[PDB]
RNA sequence: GGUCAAGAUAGUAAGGGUCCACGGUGGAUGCCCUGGCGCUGGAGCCGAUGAAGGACGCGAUUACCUGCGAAAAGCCCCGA
């Protein structure tokens, strides 16, 4: 989740979060060229996913050091 | 009436012409606005914190355009 979930956890967790999210992007990247892709909403979600992900960890990483 | 004779005149149009009817072509004309034009008034700088302008990308399907920039038709918080 977007707000929450994010910003309670470690940087050192963000960098496996998002290494997860890049690996089933890919996965759902080889279906789809494959076919049929049954859920592409699914895609662009994880897209999202892992923005945030960067989002929070610059954010807080940046107001650590306010 | 019939034969002959002398004389005169008609219709048929292969194609054309004038007019009428009915179409085709074509895009004038009328109506319209999604585009412009001028005037007045406002507002007036951007850039090594990388500009103006681009290239290549980003889409479930994406050639063009728009928006964006590997966090890629978008991510965070605030306000409506
Ligand atoms: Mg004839
Ligand atoms: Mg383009
Ligand atoms: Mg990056
Ligand atoms: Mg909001």
Do not use: C, Y
Not at 19 to 41: I, S, T, V, Y
Not at 49 to 54: D, G, K, T
């Amino acid at each position: 989740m977007k707000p929450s979930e994010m910003r309670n956890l470690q940087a050192t967790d963000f960098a496996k979060e998002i290494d997860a999210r890049k690996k089933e992007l890919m996965e759902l990247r080889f279906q789809a060229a494959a076919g049929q892709l049954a859920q592409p909403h699914r895609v662009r979600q994880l897209r999202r996913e892992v923005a945030q992900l960067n989002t929070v960890k610059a954010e807080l990483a940046r107001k650590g050091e306010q």
